[PDB]
């Protein structure tokens, strides 16, 4: 009975699930767009188009605080009763972690929040100052970490607790919360935070926040890679064990000299789509909860024997920003790489026989690019179409292109697709039915992020070589060159490198939403007309008219109120100590 209640306390951790295509943390960034006509599904549209409001929103807050309540209730049921002292202590530590985590999941969306330290309206807490919240949550995580095991329904570990504290302190040190908050006059009305009066957010840069984040990110990384038994996924032969062909990559043929590159492509596909039982020791916190794959599949996949088609929805549509910020094979940005095609020629055909639709921008790229992206003329998957890779025809309205007559008008907005998280063994059958190979946990925390977090902290503190040394394990694993001091220039700073490595490595893992926000760069990356793609919403285009830089045509905008999630109007009314977020 007790375990059942305990298990139920974990029920809210799938809130804001990474990679779920209708979720606003996933489908509102510059990573990829969804068809405008899909805006009637879910909340992504409201958030991307700034129509979310106090009366139109994802009331995430209702869920987190409900499960926080369950945690405290469990602790009470325990006190009134079963299990050893040691086991009861573990249960209490799991609840402590969960309460802290639920506050963090709320904080990262809403900003300053009520701290609920236990289960009349005048006694209601309003928001506490952001820095108060950070301190309280961090302490709670440290306390739970003392008790929890470093390694083991994925139950809490000290490793996870320290990883959450690391990300929390990284966020707290970031511009939004450490000197660049765009509403300096926003404060409480008649609620006070101990030590902060009515203030809600710091308006002054504090270097010590970066020193504290570095210490936490370092401690999390060491714990994960020692007692936590974590290491970067580096198996490069699983494709062979599953009897799969090496993938087709334009410009990198399957020849002896290119075997390492092609194996790195498959390693990256498996890195984010495998279980610990399959040899993956990189995941720190993963959930059983799955997310939809059909939204990223191409339209027509395979014609069945009865004459109907296996079909995807083809809606997850990577931007030109994504296709321009994954690296070249030399580990540089395409625009900055002196050996790469000049941008004036990016949209020309690469001239590959039988695959003339492949443009030059898509040749000469890093293994992560071919692992996770897909494009006109290229392959999608490995066993996808009854045992063979699927060749994409993004300009053919009778295969993978835009077609206004298709039910629901599913299509790629940009002319590109992603295959990240797609199991290489995924296969659709002529006789009907299909397989997606072996499911994998949805990643909340994995070890690559801890390296990137340490790099960002070093960069902020001016420790250039140390930042480089934290990035290079991730770069090497992905099969691009290591960084050296010679690579750090006015044109491409250590911070530029850290932010871009994060963009690439953690692409579509629910980070970009938060990172652009904490960097206070909403206008720069999420603003009107920033999102671009090919000319992909014209039926049956020529190669020439298809491959033109085209602004994504939907009401995307950035205004500063969008840094924070608005509070449900009823919560603002129900709680007299509660203030609405700025601009809402």
Q: Which DSSP helix (H) or strand (E) runs through 292?
A: none
Which one, 438 or 489, has the nearer CB to Ca ion? 438
Which one, 156 or 440, has the nearer CB to Ca ion? 440
280 binds Ca ion (CB under 5 A): no
**What's the CA gap between 379 and 514, in Å, rounded?**
32
Question: Has 142 been labeled as part of a binding site?
Answer: no
Q: Are 561 and 180 in contact (CB under 8 A)?
A: no
Which one, 423 or 466, has the nearer CB to Ca ion? 423
Chain residue at closest Cβ approach to Ca ion:
423
> Please, which residues have CB within 8 angstroms of residue 185's CB and are 6 or more apart in sequence?
none
Q: Are 264 and 481 in contact (CB under 8 A)?
A: no
Question: Has 32 been labeled as part of a binding site?
Answer: no
Closest separation in Å from C-beta 307 to Ca ion: 31
Segment near Ca ion (CB under 5 A), from 182-190, 317-325, 419-427, 474-482?
419-427
Maximum pairwise Cα distance, the chain: 75
Question: Has 273 been labeled as part of a binding site?
Answer: yes
* Residue whose pair of structure tokens reads 């509660």 in the numeric block: 578
CA angle at 495 for the pair 21 and 497, rounded to the nearest 5°: 70
Segment near Ca ion (CB under 5 A), from 265-273, 344-352, 366-374, 568-576?
265-273
The breaks in the chain (C to N more than 2.5 Å) occur after 81, 119, 152
Segment near Ca ion (CB under 5 A), from 38-46, 71-79, 258-266, 417-425?
417-425
**What's the CA gap between 448 and 282, in Å, rounded?**
8
Closest residue by Cα to residue 425 from 439, 413, 405, 444: 439
**What's the CA gap between 288 and 293, in Å, rounded?**
15
* Alpha carbon 24 to chain centroid, angstroms: 11
DSSP state of 256: G
Closest residue by Cα to residue 385 from 300, 314, 317: 300
Site map (CB under 5 A) of Ca ion, residues 134-153, x = contact: --------------------
266 binds Ca ion (CB under 5 A): no
Segment near Ca ion (CB under 5 A), from 112-120, 206-214, 290-298, 435-443?
435-443
Which one, 189 or 234, has the nearer CB to Ca ion? 234
422 binds Ca ion (CB under 5 A): no
273 binds Ca ion (CB under 5 A): yes
**What's the CA gap between 112 and 419, in Å, rounded?**
37
105 binds Ca ion (CB under 5 A): no
390 binds Ca ion (CB under 5 A): no
442 binds Ca ion (CB under 5 A): no
Which one, 437 or 527, has the nearer CB to Ca ion? 437
440 binds Ca ion (CB under 5 A): yes
Question: Has 487 been labeled as part of a binding site?
Answer: no
200 binds Ca ion (CB under 5 A): no
282 binds Ca ion (CB under 5 A): no
**What's the CA gap between 456 and 443, in Å, rounded?**
21
Question: Has 297 been labeled as part of a binding site?
Answer: no
CA angle at 198 for the pair 196 and 202, rounded to the nearest 5°: 55
Q: Enumerate binding residues for Ca ion (CB under 5 A).
A: 273, 423, 437-438, 440
Residues in binding site for Ca(2+): 273, 423, 438
Residues in binding site for beta-D-galactose: 21, 409-410
């Amino acid at each position: 009975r007790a375990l059942g209640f305990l298990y139920s306390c974990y029920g809210g951790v799938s809130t804001d699930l990474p990679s779920a295509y209708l979720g606003e943390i996933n489908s509102t960034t510059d990573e990829y767009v969804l068809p405008y006509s899909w805006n009637t599904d879910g909340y992504w549209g409201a958030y991307a188009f700034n129509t979310a409001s106090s009366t139109n929103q994802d009331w995430l807050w209702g869920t987190t605080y409900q499960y926080i309540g369950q945690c405290y209730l469990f602790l009470q049921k325990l006190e009134n009763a079963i299990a050893s002292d040691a086991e009861k202590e573990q249960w209490r530590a799991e609840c402590q972690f969960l309460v802290a985590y639920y506050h963090f999941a709320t904080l990262r969306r809403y900003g300053p929040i009520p701290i609920t330290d236990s289960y009349p309206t005048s006694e209601y807490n309003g928001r506490f100052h952001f820095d108060y919240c950070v301190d309280w949550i961090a302490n709670q995580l440290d306390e739970a970490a003392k008790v929890l095991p470093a390694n083991r329904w994925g139950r809490a570990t000290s490793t996870i607790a320290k990883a959450v504290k690391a990300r929390l302190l990284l966020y707290a040190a970031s511009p939004l919360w450490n000197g660049s908050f765009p509403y300096p006059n926003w404060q409480n009305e008649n609620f006070e935070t101990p030590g902060y009066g009515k203030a809600l957010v710091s308006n002054t840069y504090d270097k010590s926040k970066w020193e504290r984040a570095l210490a936490a990110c370092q401690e999390a990384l060491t714990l994960a890679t020692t007692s936590g038994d974590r290491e970067l996924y580096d198996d490069d032969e699983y494709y062979s064990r599953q009897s799969l062909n090496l993938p087709f990559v334009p410009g990198v043929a399957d020849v002896e000299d290119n075997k390492e590159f092609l194996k790195n492509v498959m390693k990256m596909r498996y890195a984010v789509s495998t279980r610990e039982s399959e040899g993956n020791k990189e995941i720190i916190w993963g959930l059983s909860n799955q997310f939809d794959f059909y939204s990223r599949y191409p339209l027509r996949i395979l014609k069945k024997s009865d004459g109907t088609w296996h079909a995807g929805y083809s809606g997850v549509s990577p931007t030109l920003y994504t296709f321009e910020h994954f690296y070249t094979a030399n580990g540089k940005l395409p625009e900055k790489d002196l050996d790469f095609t000049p941008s004036s020629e990016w949209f020309e055909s690469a001239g590959i026989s039988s695959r003339e639709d492949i443009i030059k921008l898509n040749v000469g790229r890093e293994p992560r690019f071919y692992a996770w992206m897909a494009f006109d003329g290229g392959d999608y998957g490995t066993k996808f179409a009854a045992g063979s890779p699927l060749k994409l025809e993004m300009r053919n309205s009778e295969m993978h292109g835009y077609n206004p007559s298709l039910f629901n008008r599913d299509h790629s907005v940009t002319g590109f697709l992603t295959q990240k998280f797609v199991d290489p063994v995924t296969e659709f059958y002529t006789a009907g039915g299909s397989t997606s190979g072996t499911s994998a946990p949805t990643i909340l925390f994995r070890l690559a992020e801890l390296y990137l977090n340490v790099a960002e902290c070093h960069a902020a503190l001016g420790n250039t070589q140390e930042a480089i040394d934290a990035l290079n394990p991730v770069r090497e694993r992905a099969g691009i060159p290591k960084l050296t001091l010679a690579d750090i220039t006015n044109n491409m700073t250590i911070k530029d490198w850290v932010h871009n490595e994060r963009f690439v490595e953690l692409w579509n893992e629910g980070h970009r939403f938060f990172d652009v926000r904490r960097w206070a760069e909403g206008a720069k990356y999420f603003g009107a007309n920033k999102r671009e793609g090919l000319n992909a919403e014209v039926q049956s285009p020529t190669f020439e008219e298809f491959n033109k830089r085209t602004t994504v045509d939907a009401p995307y905008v950035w205004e500063n109120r969008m840094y924070l999630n608005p509070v449900f109007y009823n919560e603002v009314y129900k709680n007299p100590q509660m203030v609405q977020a700025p601009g809402y």
